[PDB]
Structures are given as C-alpha cells and as structure tokens.
C-alpha cells in the first residue's frame, strides 16, 4: 500500500470555554424606617442588578471596620453620634449566591448578575439611635 | 474564572432611621 | 481526495471535566479512497504515533491533554510506516471522537486550539 502525498492536509478548530463577562449596577434607600428595638432581618437597602441575561458579579462590604475573610459582613458609624451598626447581605441573598472568588487570592462572594439582593441590620435585633449611617459596595465582573 | 478591574466599580448611600 | 470536517462539541464545562469528556469530532468522507491516516500536531506530541498530545487555554496560558479515544484507537484498520514516520490508519467515510486523555482533567476555563494533519492511504 501506500500513502499519497498530494492529498494531505493541515485542518484546525479552537474549543471555547468562554470566561469573558459583565455588569451592572446601582442602589436605593426604602424609607420609613424607625429608631429603636427593629425588627431581626429588617430591610434598609437593595443593590440592584440586571441585565442582558449576564451571568455572575462580585461583591464586598466596605468600611472601616470590615469584619470577614470572605467578603460581605461589615459594621458602619453614624455621622451625628457616631454608634456603630451591624450590616450584611440577607440570609436569602447568602443562599442565592454562587461562590466565594479568589481575585489573586482576595477573596469576594459572587452573585449571578440578575437580581435585587437586599441588604439587612444582621443578628439578633439592635436598639438603633434616630441618626444617619452611611454604606459603601464595591462591586465586580467576576468571570466564571 | 476571572475578575475585570474595569468593572470594579464603587457606589454607596446615606441610610437615615427616623426617631 | 479528502473531505475533512473537525467540528467542536458544545456544552462543554469549565473546571474538572468528565474522564475522556468528547471535546470534538473529526469527519473524513472520499470517494476515492478506501482509507485516511491522521496525526495531531502541537508544541508537545506525546506518543510515536501522534495521536496523544497536550493543548493550552488561549486567555491564560495552561495545558490540557488530548488524542483519540480508546474507543477510536480500536477501529483503526493497521499502523502503517511513511518513510519510518508512523500512522495508524482508519476506513473513510467515517467519524473519530477526540476527548481529553487522562482522568477526569481540569479544563481551566478558557480557549483551546487542536490542529490534525489528516492524509490519505489505499491499502
């Protein structure tokens, strides 16, 4: 037998595991909140974020005391008196999430980009001072 | 399996508990 | 002459990957001839004959194994010599899986390439 060389040839495909991926975002205080004994899983915010269909975001709690290696529980002081308060993702948000990402080995917890996850006073309850408390989110495209 | 600093985006609120 | 087809298989995961997990399908029909060989081609072939190889992911730059699957390896026809160079040959008119060789592999998430050199052979 034998192999003819006229007919060889070089054929090629790519095989596609498409990390690539976005966002978006924003976020609303709900008013008509009260001072004193709160309820447990109050709702004070809600970061909202939809999209095309877009699949997975990251996210952390920002302040001066950030308290998780994770990513998302952290406490915030007032302006007027200065108290501080317990802050955090929702317990539904926590079991919503789809994981705990390593950005160069900084952790953030991940959340699929189609939602409106609400953020709560964590624990059991907090008697609250009538005073303002600001919150900060950094949030990002973490790609799966 | 990856992260886009340009998406790192910040964004924050001013909460006020009535009283 | 050869009518050559490579065509990936979708649905395909990131991360850990069934063993042998299909990643694409070879398609050689002809007319005129009764049979093909075939080699893969890469920066790092693994075997003599040239149907295990490693591939890596485009966006970060980490390998994968590739080849034949034990199922295709036992349709070929002969192993067959081209001046010394080794082909295992196989009957046109007929598909041949490629899969990830090895175990259960890790896939890290990103774009692959694959290039065969298919030629022809009349027993």
Same mark, same amino acid.
């Given at each position: ?39 447990? =899983?109050?709702?004070? *915010?809600?970061? @909202?974020?939809?999209?095309? #269909?877009? !699949? %997975?975001? +990251? $996210?952390?709690?920002? &302040?001066?005391?950030?308290?998780? =290696?994770?990513?998302? *529980?952290?406490? @915030?002081?007032?302006?007027? #008196?200065? !108290? %501080?308060? +317990? $802050?955090?993702?929702? &317990?539904?948000?926590?079991?919503? =999430? ?47 | ?19």
């Amino acid at each position: 037998g034998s192999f003819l060389p006229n007919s060889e040839q070089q054929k090629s495909v790519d095989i596609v595991f498409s990390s690539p991926q976005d966002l978006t975002v924003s976020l609303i205080p709900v008013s008509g909140l009260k001072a004193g004994k709160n309820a447990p =899983s109050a709702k004070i *915010a809600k970061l @909202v974020v939809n999209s095309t #269909t877009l !699949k %997975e975001f +990251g $996210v952390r709690g920002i &302040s001066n005391n950030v308290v998780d =290696s994770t990513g998302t *529980a952290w406490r @915030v002081a007032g302006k007027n #008196t200065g !108290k %501080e308060i +317990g $802050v955090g993702l929702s &317990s539904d948000s926590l079991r919503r =999430s789809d994981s705990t990402e390593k950005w160069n080995g900084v952790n953030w917890m991940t959340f699929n980009s189609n939602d409106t996850l609400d953020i709560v006073l964590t624990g059991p309850a907090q008697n609250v001072t009538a005073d303002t408390y600001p919150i900060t989110l950094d949030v990002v495209g973490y790609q799966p | 399996g990856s992260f886009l600093p340009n998406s790192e985006q910040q964004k924050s609120v001013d909460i006020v508990f009535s009283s």
